[PDB]
Amino acid sequence: PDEITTAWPVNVGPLNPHLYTPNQMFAQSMVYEPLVKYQADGSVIPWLAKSWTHSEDGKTWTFTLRDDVKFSNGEPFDAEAAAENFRAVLDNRQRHAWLELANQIVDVKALSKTELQITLKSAYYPFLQELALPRPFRFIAPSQFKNHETMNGIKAPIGTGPWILQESKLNQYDVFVRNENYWGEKPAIKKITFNVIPDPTTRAVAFETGDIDLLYGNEGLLPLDTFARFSQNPAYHTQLSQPIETVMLALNTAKAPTNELAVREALNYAVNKKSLIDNALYGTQQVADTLFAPSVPYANLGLKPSQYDPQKAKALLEKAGWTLPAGKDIREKNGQPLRIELSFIGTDALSKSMAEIIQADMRQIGADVSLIGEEESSIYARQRDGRFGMIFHRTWGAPYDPHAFLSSMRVPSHADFQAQQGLADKPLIDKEIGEVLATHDETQRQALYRDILTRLHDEAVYLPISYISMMVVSKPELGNIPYAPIATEIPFEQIKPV
């Protein structure tokens, strides 16, 4: 009644707060906590830090910490424990290159038990928002470091947060219980069991049978026709949030024939996205015309959508010299067929379904898309090294969008750098992304985001497909299930059946 059972496609991992896979971000966020806490309005509030000051040049910050917080094993949280966490994270600095605060922090020291001083290389504006992320700047008890580090593993995953990992059984389940000595608000739920169920259909079956009480996740959570059925079944409860991030193709500007602007612009008019969403996504998601929805901070720019218009796509191709050989449906230019490889995770039925639609729509304008569905490791390798024509991709949701997603475009081992590498203006874009991150002149910050997002739109680097939502299927007794401000978090401590 105050215990729930839910599911996740894999175990939560070791819950090292400072590492990535196989740790699951939402589980790191249940056990470990930040200095400051992200809010839906884009601000942060005091959290383990009660307050803070900064220097006039914006580079030196001093946080006053709570003095009443203990880790779940009774050891105190104080500035020394925080400073040792920052050292453990930055001892592995290379791994966090995607996150610009990890390159900005030049020193962290405890000035006393309650005062923590962080010095930055520059006046990095997103500092507090990156400190609020699920990882890596959250705090494990230093006693649980292994030989004074975390990058080589941890002992027990001891955090300050409202949940404690009770036990994990690999390939089976993970069980958390409420922290009875939490410094903040006491959750209503006392125990949460996660059953490991990798297949979406099997998840839906688990819920119908009553084996689980709650499913919570993005558009991959369960089959969408099933979800629509469940939303009409008065024995169940369902929800669909307002959109949290964009799903899009990345087009390789450095690889033929996507290296041609006119080919990328044509592809951007070839897909009927509303039909795609109604055919493959059961009508449950929203059409996307831009990298970021106009509701994302800094991104209400009046960018012009490319509406589905196969006549215009064909015209653009014809004008660029891609015309149809006698008796053939696939265009050719300089003897080369207009062929494009579309990469995605082959096991993933929803991705395959979308890819088949996109392939069919692009065949109608004379582009031959070849589907390359591979296991996830091979797709991630392709993202990193630029071995793709088109690849499925997504943004990151709040509080990463847009700043941190844009920051990462500079990192060479990410899909977006690779996709953009054929642009003559790539250096300028990357210089402008560095400038926007440290700008405190609000007019210049808006102007730099407008320039970067407008160049990316006008160069047709992406094919935005949908703004996707979180969705929930639950037993009615759990009541209304809230959403967290951070798109990757699950706010279990806010569920309040009574």
Give all domains of the chain, ordered by start, each with its CATH number.
1-241+470-498 (3.40.190.10), 242-469 (3.10.105.10)
Spell out the residues 6+ positions from residue 416 whose beta carbon is closer than 8 angstroms to its own. Answer: 250, 393, 405, 408, 409, 461
CA pair distance 47, 230, nearest whole angstrom: 38
Neighbours of 316 (CB within 10 A): 23
Q: Is 494 helix (H, G, I), strand (E, B) or coil?
A: helix
Q: Is 8 helix (H, G, I), strand (E, B) or coil?
A: strand
245, exposed or middle or buried, with CB in 10 Å at 0-12, 13-18, 19+? buried
The tokens for 4 are 């729930």
Q: Give DSSP secondary structure letters for 99-135.
A: STHHHHEEEEEESSSSEEEEEESS--TTHHHHHTSSS
Burial 299-311 (b: 16+ CB within 10 A, else e): bebebeebebbbe
Contact 115, 83 (CB under 8 A): no
The closest of 105, 113, 137, 131 to 46, measured between CA atoms, is: 131
User: Which amino acid is located at 98 in the chain?
Assistant: W
Contact 216, 495 (CB under 8 A): no
- Element holding 336 (H helix, E strand): strand 336-337
The closest of 127, 128, 113 to 82, measured between CA atoms, is: 113
The tokens for 430 are 């990357």
CA angle 230, 466, 408 (to 5 degrees): 120
Q: What is the resolution of this structure in A?
A: 1.7
Q: Which DSSP symbol is given to 391?
A: E
Contact 215, 222 (CB under 8 A): yes
Spell out the residues 6+ positions from residue 232 whose beta carbon is closer than 8 angstroms to its own. Answer: none
CA angle 16, 131, 90 (to 5 degrees): 55
Spell out the residues 6+ positions from residue 263 whose beta carbon is closer than 8 angstroms to its own. Answer: 257, 317, 320, 322, 338, 367
Distance of CA 390 to the CA centre of its chain: 19
Contact 324, 366 (CB under 8 A): yes
Technique used to solve these coordinates: X-ray
The tokens for 269 are 């008019």
The tokens for 72 are 């779940």
Q: Which DSSP symbol is given to 243?
A: P
CA pair distance 47, 26, nearest whole angstrom: 18
Q: Is 468 helix (H, G, I), strand (E, B) or coil?
A: strand
Neighbours of 275 (CB within 10 A): 13
The tokens for 436 are 């926007």
